[PDB]
Design a protein around this ligand. Structure first.
Ligand SMILES: CCCCCCCC/C=C\CCCCCCCC(=O)OC[C@H](O)CO
Ligand SMILES: CCCCCCCC/C=C\CCCCCCCC(=O)OC[C@H](O)CO
Ligand SMILES: *C\C=C(C)/C=C/C=C(C)/C=C/C1=C(C)CCCC1(C)C
Ligand SMILES: CCCCCCCC/C=C\CCCCCCCC(=O)O
Ligand SMILES: CCCCCCCC/C=C\CCCCCCCC(=O)O
Ligand SMILES: CCCCCCCC/C=C\CCCCCCCC(=O)O
Ligand SMILES: CCCCCCCC/C=C\CCCCCCCC(=O)O
Ligand SMILES: CCCCCCCC/C=C\CCCCCCCC(=O)O
Ligand SMILES: CCCCCCCC/C=C\CCCCCCCC(=O)O
Length: 265
């Protein structure tokens, strides 16, 4: 998978290579810092919603381990030689992020459905269609980026297929939010609409990074893609989880859970 990504095509200046390394390692620290937060505030969530904050912990660690794995793969693969970092081994590839997405996206979706107060048949049914649409998106996406070096045309048509799943996924998500918004407590009917618009923005950065090979095939495009992945990860995983957590606590408080009411107090 190494040779099929544009990272293997270029040498990098010390500044480019350390900026990328620092993006990944900072990504590690942010996620593991938020994990502690999500862990601590779990005691303040009513049992109804406590699973949502647990899913955020799972996402933080899932993301933090892959980012930490990328950081080390990145430093293993390149060596500073004659004024530039040059590929030394086929150890780095973007495919591990797509694994991170296969795993984290179901958790991110399930934590949304939980605070929407779905349950039983509907929860299990909606979750199945969302996870299947999402995996189709990710899988067709992973296939396309195998060609970002060799066959740009294939990257695009696999991206087209991937985008179809994305649109259908977002339509289901939005439909369930706007139909169950009135069931939410403590005023969170207002906050969940903002979470959806956060989702739309943050999730759309990935397909933009996915296309960098086609419109910026150079080492600065490699930096830019990683920068875009870093903003997208922080927004779609960390900030989103914080908002999901805030909604969980607020509704817990409005439901008469005292540890929630004392925390907000
Ligand atoms: C094209 C792939 C999907 C096409 C068919 C997807 C239909 C499944 C679906 O959309 O179900 C969502 C529903 O709102 C939940 O109960
Ligand atoms: C492969 C190329 C095809 C390109 C795709 C062209 C169509 C894009 C249309 C909408 C954006 C999709 C995002 C869907 C936004 C959520 C919609 C929604 O929430 O529906 C509201 C609901 O009906 C109220 O109850
Ligand atoms: C870390 C969390 C998330 C939710 C990752 C989201 C990724 C996507 C929405 C990916 C989308 C793609 C599109 C729509 C088509 C090109 C290929 C991608 C998989 C990158
Ligand atoms: C909670 C406190 C914050 C947790 C972060 C702790 C350390 C993360 C850094 C892991 C090392 C990454 C560097 C690996 C490398 O670049 O080779
Ligand atoms: C921002 C990163 C810095 C991390 C250092 C934090 C060190 C302490 C780690 C977590 C323990 C703090 C949480 C204590 C539980 C509070 C429950 C209560 O309110 O009684
Ligand atoms: C991949 C296709 C199948 C996907 C199945 C997804 C359905 C999973 C449903 C729930 C799993 C964990 C959450 C538990 C529900 C919370 C119930 C409660 O809090 O009382
Ligand atoms: C590894 C777990 C995958 C789960 C499969 C079930 C979910 C179905 C999702 C979408 C199917 C898309 C299949 C298209 C792949 C064609 C690429 C190829 O040639 O291998
Ligand atoms: C299930 C997945 C649904 C449709 C996948 C369509 C992908 C076909 C593109 C193949 C590209 C090629 O090898 O020429
Ligand atoms: C991800 C978004 C997917 C949108 C894909 C855009 C549709 C493709 C348009 C034209 C394809 C032109 C291919 C010629 C480039 C060299 C091969």
């Amino acid at each position: 998978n190494s040779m099929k990504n544009i990272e293997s095509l270029f040498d990098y200046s010390a500044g480019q290579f350390e900026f990328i390394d620092h993006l990944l390692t900072m990504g590690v620290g942010v996620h593991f810092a938020a994990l502690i937060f999500f862990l601590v505030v779990s005691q303040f969530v009513a049992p109804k919603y406590r699973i949502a904050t647990a899913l955020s912990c799972i996402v933080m660690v899932s993301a933090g381990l892959i980012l930490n794995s990328q950081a080390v793969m990145w430093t293993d693969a390149y060596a500073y030689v004659d004024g530039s970092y040059q590929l030394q081994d086929l150890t780095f590839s973007n495919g591990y992020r797509y694994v991170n997405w296969m795993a984290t996206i179901p958790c991110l979706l399930l934590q949304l459905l939980i605070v929407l107060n779905l349950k039983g048949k509907e929860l299990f049914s909606t979750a199945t269609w969302l996870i299947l649409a999402a995996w189709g998106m990710i899988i067709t996406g992973y296939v396309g980026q195998l060609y970002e070096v060799d066959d740009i045309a294939q990257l695009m048509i696999w991206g087209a297929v991937s985008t179809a799943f994305f649109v259908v996924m977002n339509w289901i998500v939005g439909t369930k939010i706007f139909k169950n918004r009135a069931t939410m407590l403590g005023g969170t009917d207002s906050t969940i609409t903002k979470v959806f618009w956060l989702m739309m923005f943050a999730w759309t950065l990935y397909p933009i990074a996915y296309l960098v090979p086609a419109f910026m095939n150079n080492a600065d495009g490699v930096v830019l893609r990683q920068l875009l992945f870093t903003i997208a990860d922080i927004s779609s995983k960390v900030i989103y989880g914080l908002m999901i957590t805030y909604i969980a606590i607020q509704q817990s408080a409005a439901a008469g859970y005292v540890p929630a009411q004392q925390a907000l107090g």
